[PDB]
Tab-separated table of C-alpha atoms and ligand atoms in Angstrom:
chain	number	residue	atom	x	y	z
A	1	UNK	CA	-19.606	-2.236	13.554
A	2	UNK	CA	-18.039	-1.778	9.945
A	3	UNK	CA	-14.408	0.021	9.618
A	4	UNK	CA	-13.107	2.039	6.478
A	5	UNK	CA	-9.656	2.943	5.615
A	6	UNK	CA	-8.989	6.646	3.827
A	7	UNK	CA	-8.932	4.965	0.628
A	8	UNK	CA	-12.614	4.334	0.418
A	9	UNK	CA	-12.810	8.212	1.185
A	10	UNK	CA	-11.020	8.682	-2.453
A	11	UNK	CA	-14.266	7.289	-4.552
A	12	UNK	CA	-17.185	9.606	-3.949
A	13	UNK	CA	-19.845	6.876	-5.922
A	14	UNK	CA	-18.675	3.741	-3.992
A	15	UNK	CA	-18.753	5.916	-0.614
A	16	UNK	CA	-22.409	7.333	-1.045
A	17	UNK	CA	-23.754	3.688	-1.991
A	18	UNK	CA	-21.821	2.368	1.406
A	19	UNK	CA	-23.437	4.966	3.263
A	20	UNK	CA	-27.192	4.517	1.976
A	21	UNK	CA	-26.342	1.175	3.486
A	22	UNK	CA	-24.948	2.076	6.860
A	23	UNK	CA	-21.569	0.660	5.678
A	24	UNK	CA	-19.288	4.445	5.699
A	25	UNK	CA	-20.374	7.659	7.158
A	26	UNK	CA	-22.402	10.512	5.346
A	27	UNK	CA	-21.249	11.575	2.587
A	28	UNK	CA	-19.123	15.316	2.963
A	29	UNK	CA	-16.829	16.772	0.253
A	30	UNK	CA	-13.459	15.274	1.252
A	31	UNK	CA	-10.532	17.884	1.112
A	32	UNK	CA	-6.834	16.884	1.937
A	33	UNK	CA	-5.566	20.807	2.111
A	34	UNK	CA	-6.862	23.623	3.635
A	35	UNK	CA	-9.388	25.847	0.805
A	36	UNK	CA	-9.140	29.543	0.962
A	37	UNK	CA	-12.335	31.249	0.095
A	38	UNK	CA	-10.347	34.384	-0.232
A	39	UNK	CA	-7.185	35.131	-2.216
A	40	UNK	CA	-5.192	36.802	0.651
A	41	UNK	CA	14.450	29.699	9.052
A	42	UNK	CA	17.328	26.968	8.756
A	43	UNK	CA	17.607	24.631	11.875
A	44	UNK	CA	20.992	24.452	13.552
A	45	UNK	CA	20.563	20.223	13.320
A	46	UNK	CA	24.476	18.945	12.494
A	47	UNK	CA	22.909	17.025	9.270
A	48	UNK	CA	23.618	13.074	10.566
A	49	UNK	CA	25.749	10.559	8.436
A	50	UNK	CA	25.125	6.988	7.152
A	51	UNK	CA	26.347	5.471	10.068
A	52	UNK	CA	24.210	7.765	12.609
A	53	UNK	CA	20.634	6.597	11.034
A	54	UNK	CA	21.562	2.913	11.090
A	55	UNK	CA	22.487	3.308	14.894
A	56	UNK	CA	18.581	4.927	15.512
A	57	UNK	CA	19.468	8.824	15.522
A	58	UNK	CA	16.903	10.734	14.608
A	59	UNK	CA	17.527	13.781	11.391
A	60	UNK	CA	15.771	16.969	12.990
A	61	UNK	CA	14.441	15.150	16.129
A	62	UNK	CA	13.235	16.299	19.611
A	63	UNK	CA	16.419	18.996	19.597
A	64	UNK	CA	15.892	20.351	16.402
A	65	UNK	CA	15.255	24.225	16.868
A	66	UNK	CA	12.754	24.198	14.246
A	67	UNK	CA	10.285	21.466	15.737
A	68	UNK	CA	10.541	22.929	19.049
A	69	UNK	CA	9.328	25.988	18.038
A	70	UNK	CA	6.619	24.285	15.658
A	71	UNK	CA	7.930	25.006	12.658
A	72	UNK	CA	8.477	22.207	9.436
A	73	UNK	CA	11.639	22.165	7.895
A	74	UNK	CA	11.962	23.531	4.396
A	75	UNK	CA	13.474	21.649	1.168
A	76	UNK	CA	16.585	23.340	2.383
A	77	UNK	CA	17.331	21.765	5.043
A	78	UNK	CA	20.871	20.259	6.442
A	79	UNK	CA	18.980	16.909	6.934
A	80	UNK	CA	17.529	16.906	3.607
A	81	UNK	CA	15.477	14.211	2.533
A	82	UNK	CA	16.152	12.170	5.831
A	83	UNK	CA	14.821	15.038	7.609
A	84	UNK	CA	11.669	13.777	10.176
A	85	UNK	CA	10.311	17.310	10.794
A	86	UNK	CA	8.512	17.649	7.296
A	87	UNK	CA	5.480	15.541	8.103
A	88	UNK	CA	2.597	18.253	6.855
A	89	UNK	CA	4.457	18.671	3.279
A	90	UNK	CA	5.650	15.012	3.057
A	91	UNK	CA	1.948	13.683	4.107
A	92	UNK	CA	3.194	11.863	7.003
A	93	UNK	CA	-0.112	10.998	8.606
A	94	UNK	CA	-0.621	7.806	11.272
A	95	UNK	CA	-2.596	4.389	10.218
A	96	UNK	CA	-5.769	5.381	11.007
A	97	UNK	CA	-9.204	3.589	10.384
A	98	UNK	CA	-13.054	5.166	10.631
A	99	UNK	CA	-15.254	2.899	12.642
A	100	UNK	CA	-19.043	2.958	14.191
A	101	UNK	CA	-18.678	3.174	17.400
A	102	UNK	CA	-22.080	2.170	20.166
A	103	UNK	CA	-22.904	5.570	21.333
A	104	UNK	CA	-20.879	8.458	19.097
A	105	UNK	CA	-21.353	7.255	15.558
A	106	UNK	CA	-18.724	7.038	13.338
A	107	UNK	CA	-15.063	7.745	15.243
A	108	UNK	CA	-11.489	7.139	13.891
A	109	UNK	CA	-8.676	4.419	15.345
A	110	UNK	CA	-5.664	3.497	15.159
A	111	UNK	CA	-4.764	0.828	12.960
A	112	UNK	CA	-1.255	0.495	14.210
A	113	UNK	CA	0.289	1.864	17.915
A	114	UNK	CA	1.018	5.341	17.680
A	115	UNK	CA	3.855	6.730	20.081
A	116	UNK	CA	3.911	9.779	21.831
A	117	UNK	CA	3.464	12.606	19.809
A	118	UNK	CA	2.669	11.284	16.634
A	119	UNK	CA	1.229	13.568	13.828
A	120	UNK	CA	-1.994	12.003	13.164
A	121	UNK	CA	-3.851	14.301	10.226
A	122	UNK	CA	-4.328	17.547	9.618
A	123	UNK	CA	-7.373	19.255	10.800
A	124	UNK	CA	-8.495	20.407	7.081
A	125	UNK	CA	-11.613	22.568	6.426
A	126	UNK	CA	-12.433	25.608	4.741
A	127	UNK	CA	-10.310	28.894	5.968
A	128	UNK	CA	-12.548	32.109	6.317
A	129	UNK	CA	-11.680	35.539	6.969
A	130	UNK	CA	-13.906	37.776	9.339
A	131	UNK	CA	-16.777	38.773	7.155
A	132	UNK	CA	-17.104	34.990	5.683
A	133	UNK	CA	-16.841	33.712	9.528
A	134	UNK	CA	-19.542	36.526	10.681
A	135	UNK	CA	-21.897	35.309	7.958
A	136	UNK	CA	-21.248	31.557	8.164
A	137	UNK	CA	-22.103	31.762	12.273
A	138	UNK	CA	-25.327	33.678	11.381
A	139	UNK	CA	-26.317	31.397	8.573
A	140	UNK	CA	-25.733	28.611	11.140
A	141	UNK	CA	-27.439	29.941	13.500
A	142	UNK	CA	-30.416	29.676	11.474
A	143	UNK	CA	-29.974	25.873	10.210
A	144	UNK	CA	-30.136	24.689	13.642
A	145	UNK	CA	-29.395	20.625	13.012
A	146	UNK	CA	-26.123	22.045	11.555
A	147	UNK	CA	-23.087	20.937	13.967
A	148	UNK	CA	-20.274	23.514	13.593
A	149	UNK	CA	-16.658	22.824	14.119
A	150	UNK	CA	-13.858	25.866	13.808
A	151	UNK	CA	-10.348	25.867	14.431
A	152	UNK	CA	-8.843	29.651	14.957
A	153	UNK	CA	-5.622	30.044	13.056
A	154	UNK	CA	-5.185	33.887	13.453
A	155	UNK	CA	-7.702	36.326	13.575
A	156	UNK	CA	-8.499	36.796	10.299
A	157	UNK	CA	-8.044	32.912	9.178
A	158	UNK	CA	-10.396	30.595	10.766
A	159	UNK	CA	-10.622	26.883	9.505
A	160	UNK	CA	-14.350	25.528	9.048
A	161	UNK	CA	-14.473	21.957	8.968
A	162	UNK	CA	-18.192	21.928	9.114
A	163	UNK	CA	-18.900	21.061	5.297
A	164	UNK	CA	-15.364	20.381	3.846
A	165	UNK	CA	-12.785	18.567	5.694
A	166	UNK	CA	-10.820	14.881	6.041
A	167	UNK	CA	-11.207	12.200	8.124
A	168	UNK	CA	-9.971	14.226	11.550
A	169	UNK	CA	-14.237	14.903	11.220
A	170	UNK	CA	-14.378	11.394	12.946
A	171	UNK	CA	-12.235	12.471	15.832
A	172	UNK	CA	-14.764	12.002	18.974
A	173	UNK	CA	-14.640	13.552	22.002
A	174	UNK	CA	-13.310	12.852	25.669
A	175	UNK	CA	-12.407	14.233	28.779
A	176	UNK	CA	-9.651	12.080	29.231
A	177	UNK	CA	-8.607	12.684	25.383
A	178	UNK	CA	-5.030	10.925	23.840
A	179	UNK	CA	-4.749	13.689	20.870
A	180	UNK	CA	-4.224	17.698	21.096
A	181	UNK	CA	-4.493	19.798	18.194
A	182	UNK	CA	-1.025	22.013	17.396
A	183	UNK	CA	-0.592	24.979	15.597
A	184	UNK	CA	2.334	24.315	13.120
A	185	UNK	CA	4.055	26.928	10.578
A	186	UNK	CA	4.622	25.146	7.302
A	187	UNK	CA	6.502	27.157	4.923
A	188	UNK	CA	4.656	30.538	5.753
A	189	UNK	CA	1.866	29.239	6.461
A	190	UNK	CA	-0.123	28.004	9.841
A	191	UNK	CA	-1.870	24.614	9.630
A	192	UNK	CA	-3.257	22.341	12.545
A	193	UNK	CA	-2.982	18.803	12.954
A	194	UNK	CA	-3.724	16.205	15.680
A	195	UNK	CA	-1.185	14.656	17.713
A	196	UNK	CA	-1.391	11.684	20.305
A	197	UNK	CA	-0.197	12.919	23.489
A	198	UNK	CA	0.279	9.297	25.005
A	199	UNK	CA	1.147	5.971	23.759
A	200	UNK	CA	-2.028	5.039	21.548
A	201	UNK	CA	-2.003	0.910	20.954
A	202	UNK	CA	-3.334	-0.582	18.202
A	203	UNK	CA	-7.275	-0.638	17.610
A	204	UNK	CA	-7.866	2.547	19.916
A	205	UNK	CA	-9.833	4.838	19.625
A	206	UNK	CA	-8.432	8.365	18.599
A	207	UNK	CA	-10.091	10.835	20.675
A	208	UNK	CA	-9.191	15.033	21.615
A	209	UNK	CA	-10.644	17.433	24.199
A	210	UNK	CA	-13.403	19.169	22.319
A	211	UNK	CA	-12.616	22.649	24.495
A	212	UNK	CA	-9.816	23.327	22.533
A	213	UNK	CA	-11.655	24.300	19.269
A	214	UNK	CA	-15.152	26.608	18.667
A	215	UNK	CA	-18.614	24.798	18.285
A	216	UNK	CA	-22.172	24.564	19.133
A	217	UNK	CA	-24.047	26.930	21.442
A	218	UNK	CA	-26.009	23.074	22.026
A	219	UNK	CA	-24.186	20.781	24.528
A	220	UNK	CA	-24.220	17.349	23.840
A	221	UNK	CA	-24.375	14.759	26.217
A	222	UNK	CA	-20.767	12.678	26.832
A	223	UNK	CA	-20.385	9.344	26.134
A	224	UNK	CA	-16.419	9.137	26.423
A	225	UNK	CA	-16.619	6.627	29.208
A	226	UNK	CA	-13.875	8.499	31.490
A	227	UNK	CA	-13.564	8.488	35.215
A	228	UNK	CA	-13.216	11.948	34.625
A	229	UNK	CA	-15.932	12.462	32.544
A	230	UNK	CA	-17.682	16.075	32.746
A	231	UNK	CA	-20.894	14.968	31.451
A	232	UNK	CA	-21.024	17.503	28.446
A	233	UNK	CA	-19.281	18.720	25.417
A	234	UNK	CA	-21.363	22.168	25.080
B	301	76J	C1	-12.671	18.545	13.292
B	301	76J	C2	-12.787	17.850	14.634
B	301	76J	C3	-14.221	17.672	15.136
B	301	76J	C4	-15.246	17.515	14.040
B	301	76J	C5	-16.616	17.087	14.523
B	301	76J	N1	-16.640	15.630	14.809
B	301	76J	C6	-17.975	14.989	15.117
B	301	76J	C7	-17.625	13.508	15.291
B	301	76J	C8	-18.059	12.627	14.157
B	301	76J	C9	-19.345	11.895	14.454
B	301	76J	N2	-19.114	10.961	15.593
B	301	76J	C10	-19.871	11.134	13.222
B	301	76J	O1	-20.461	10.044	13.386
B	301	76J	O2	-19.676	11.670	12.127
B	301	76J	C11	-18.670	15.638	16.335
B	301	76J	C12	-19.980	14.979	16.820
B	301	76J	O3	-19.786	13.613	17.249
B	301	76J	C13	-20.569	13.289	18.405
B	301	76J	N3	-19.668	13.019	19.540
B	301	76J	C14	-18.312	13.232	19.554
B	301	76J	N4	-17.780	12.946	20.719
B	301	76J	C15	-18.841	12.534	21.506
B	301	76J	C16	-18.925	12.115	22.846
B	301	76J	N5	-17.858	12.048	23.638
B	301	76J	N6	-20.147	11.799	23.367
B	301	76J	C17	-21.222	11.905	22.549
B	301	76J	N7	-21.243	12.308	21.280
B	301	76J	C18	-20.011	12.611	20.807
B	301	76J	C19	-21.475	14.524	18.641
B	301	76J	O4	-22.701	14.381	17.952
B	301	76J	C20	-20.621	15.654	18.048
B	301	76J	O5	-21.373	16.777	17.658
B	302	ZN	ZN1	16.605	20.484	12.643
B	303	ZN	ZN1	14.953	19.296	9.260
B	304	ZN	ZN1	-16.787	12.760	28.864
């Protein structure tokens, strides 16, 4: 159908006229961070030289100590600015594009080939503690057309992407998916974001196994289109 880059996200008027028309999804209050609703490790990388970037060596790479435990780099790091393992602070998201798909709405793509790997975007949403989590699942549970979407952090932190959240909203479901979530630790802090776990070319679609997160008591019917396919996401 029509496609939208994150740009078109940015202007909240232009957006809701474009979706009156079919033209972008629904309208949702776009957040690029995590919102709290409640106030609540140097790697041991040799930092690389001029002439080891130029021949393709990667600052803070697949060996760094720090990205293999899931943990960004802080601004004090050997690598410094070079440094590839700061891609929540730094922004570092994939070329990605919101499209209508036939059968699951609106979905995301994307817009250049992704390697293996590849941070996509955050999973962004509200964060509840316990008592705000208890009452949003009963008020929920009352709505009933309401689709809910949570992401556990840590017991007491749970992100709620239902009402608030970025463009990983758009990220479909399959049983053969090419994105996982991953829990990251960015300076203190945990934060998820999607990452393709094959090879994604150019104009595919962006897709992650649905089990991995908390939603609906409803199962919806599964259009992914896999020779796996289980039939549902419930
Ligand atoms: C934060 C990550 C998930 C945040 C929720 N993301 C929406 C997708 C955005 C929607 N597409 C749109 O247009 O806004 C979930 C809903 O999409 C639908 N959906 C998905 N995957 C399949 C499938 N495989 N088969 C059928 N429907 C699907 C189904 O309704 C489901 O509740
Ligand atoms: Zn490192
Ligand atoms: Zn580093
Ligand atoms: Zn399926």
């Amino acid at each position: 159908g029509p496609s939208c880059v994150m740009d078109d996200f940015r202007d909240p008027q232009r957006w809701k006229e474009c979706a009156k028309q079919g033209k972008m999804p629904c309208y949702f209050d776009l957040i690029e961070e995590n919102v709290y609703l409640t106030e609540r490790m140097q790697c041991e990388c040799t930092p690389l030289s001029k002439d080891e970037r130029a021949q393709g060596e990667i600052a803070c790479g697949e060996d760094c100590l720090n990205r293999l435990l899931m943990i960004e780099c802080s601004s004090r790091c050997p690598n410094g600015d070079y440094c590839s393992n700061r891609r929540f602070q730094r922004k570092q998201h994939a070329d990605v594009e919101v499209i209508l798909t036939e059968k699951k709405g609106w979905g995301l793509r994307a817009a250049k080939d992704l390697p293996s790997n590849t941070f996509v975007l955050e999973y962004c949403g509200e964060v509840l503690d316990h008592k705000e989590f208890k009452a949003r699942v009963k008020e929920y549970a009352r709505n009933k057309n309401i689709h809910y979407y949570f992401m556990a952090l840590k017991n007491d932190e749970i992100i709620d992407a239902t009402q608030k959240g970025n463009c990983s909203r758009f990220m479909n479901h399959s049983c053969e998916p090419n994105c996982e979530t991953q829990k990251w630790t960015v300076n203190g802090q945990l934060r998820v974001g999607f990452f393709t776990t094959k090879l994604v070319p150019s104009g595919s679609e962006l897709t992650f196994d649905y089990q991995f997160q908390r939603y609906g008591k409803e199962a919806q019917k599964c259009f992914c289109g896999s020779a796996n396919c289980r039939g549902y996401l419930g």
